[PDB]
Ligand binder design. Structure first.
Ligand code: HEM
Length: 392
């Protein structure tokens, strides 16, 4: 209620961003590609051009961090790392995620894992695909590829939730001090248990890109391993869910996919563009004063990269709100770009491909259960909250 971009920006709330992000980002792309949102106490980049320019600029921005990220992940986590520290951390975590390295696991581990949960839901006769199928597949396949084959999914899942709860533990006082330190304790305990597991892919972590006499240590690596458990463990499953949901909005395209599995790589890419799971949670911080258009950002301020809005940018895509398997080919920013580009960007679509291959081979008649609704939520991380389905 009032009695004008700046005026409007001051009224936008986090709850509106969480619940109705698309019309907000539609206005932002048009009126303020880099916008300060007072309720978010941060900048948000909404266009393809602004997101790619900020994300790729290794001279004037650094990878994002925050008090919670320092508290939960530890210092020199890979997200906020730059320079030789970042190059070294990428030298540690990237090798097992390259296609030549993970290729044998696809048929030796991933597809057998998928078929285990496929059989589980087959006995059910129907399913809530996210908790019943996509999430267990994602947790197990990411846990395996990063060298935690011997950690059970129940433990990987508890670690994920403890780290997430810690990142969400933002309550602060006027001095910038956390007021709920108890909300970090599950994350602290998770970190201790990860250390307990690893202290006795892994050999690559210590040695790859390092002098044979100077390997890495566990404390140098633990922040970046927690990054993966927090941010990698669930996202292949989220890609499956965004892709499944998008296909259901185009029945004729879903039908085609169920009769031709070679269309799945394209559907999965369009799924990521249509509902980017990491919608605005990526960020950078200015290293010096930066002015883009009318936005003057200053060192230390948070700049969220709304890759999800960039992937819905009318200047790049025609009718970007529509899922379209036959869309004119174009890259997307759902994995980011530049030096911080997702280390899992080659592995995640292969897990998702095999998960959907097996799903549509066994249940080609699969469809959303019309006795249920599909709630969709979030602007930092965005996706469906469940996917109740039926099949013949
Ligand atoms: C479809 C699934 C996934 C999506 C959509 C996704 C998305 C993203 C995004 C948007 C970023 C930030 C890029 C930027 O700052 O510009 C990122 C970073 C990262 N992701 Fe993923 N991710 C996925 C899966 C995974 C998996 C499975 C792993 C590990 C096995 C992983 C590991 C990482 C790491 C280590 C980084 C940090 C890279 C750096 O800062 O240098 N991700 N991801």
């Amino acid at each position: 209620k009032h009695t004008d971009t700046q005026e409007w920006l001051a009224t936008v709330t986090v709850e509106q961003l969480e619940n109705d992000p698309y019309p907000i980002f539609e206005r932002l792309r048009r009126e303020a590609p880099v916008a300060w949102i007072p309720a978010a106490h941060a900048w948000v980049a909404s266009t393809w051009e602004a997101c790619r320019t900020i994300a790729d600029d290794a001279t004037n921005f650094r990878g994002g961090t925050s008090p919670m990220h320092e508290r939960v992940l530890g210092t020199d986590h890979i997200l906020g790392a730059e320079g030789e520290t970042h190059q070294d951390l990428r030298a540690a975590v990237d090798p097992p995620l390259k296609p030549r390295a993970f290729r044998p696991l696809l048929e030796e581990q991933v597809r057998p894992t998928v078929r285990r949960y496929l059989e589980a839901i087959r006995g059910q006769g129907k399913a809530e695909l996210m908790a019943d199928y996509f999430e267990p597949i994602s947790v197990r396949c990411v846990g395996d590829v990063i060298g935690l084959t011997d950690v059970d999914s129940d433990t990987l899942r508890r670690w994920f939730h403890a780290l997430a709860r810690g990142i969400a533990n933002t309550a602060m006082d006027a001095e910038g001090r956390f007021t709920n330190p108890g909300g970090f304790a599950p994350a602290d305990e998770a970190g201790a248990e990860i250390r307990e597991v690893l202290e006795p892919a892994l050999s690559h972590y210590l040695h790859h890109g390092r002098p044979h006499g100077d390997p890495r240590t566990l404390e140098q690596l633990l922040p970046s391993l927690k990054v993966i458990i927090l941010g990698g463990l669930q996202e292949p499953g989220h890609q499956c869910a965004a892709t499944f949901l998008g296909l259901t909005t185009r029945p004729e395209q879903l039908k085609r996919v169920t009769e031709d599995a070679t269309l799945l790589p394209r559907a999965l890419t369009e799924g990521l563009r249509w509902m980017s799971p990491v919608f605005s949670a990526s960020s950078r911080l200015p290293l010096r004063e930066i002015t883009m258009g009318e936005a003057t950002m200053r060192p230390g301020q948070t700049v969220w990269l709304s890759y999800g809005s960039a992937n819905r940018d009318e200047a790049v895509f025609d009718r970007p709100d529509v899922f379209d398997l036959d869309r004119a080919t174009h890259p997307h920013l759902a994995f980011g770009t530049g030096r911080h580009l997702c280390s899992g960007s080659a592995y995640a679509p292969q897990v998702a491909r095999i998960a959907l291959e097996e799903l549509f081979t066994a249940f080609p008649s699969i469809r959303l259960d019309p006795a249920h609704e599909v709630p969709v939520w979030g602007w930092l991380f965005r996706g469906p909250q469940r996917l109740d389905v039926l099949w013949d």
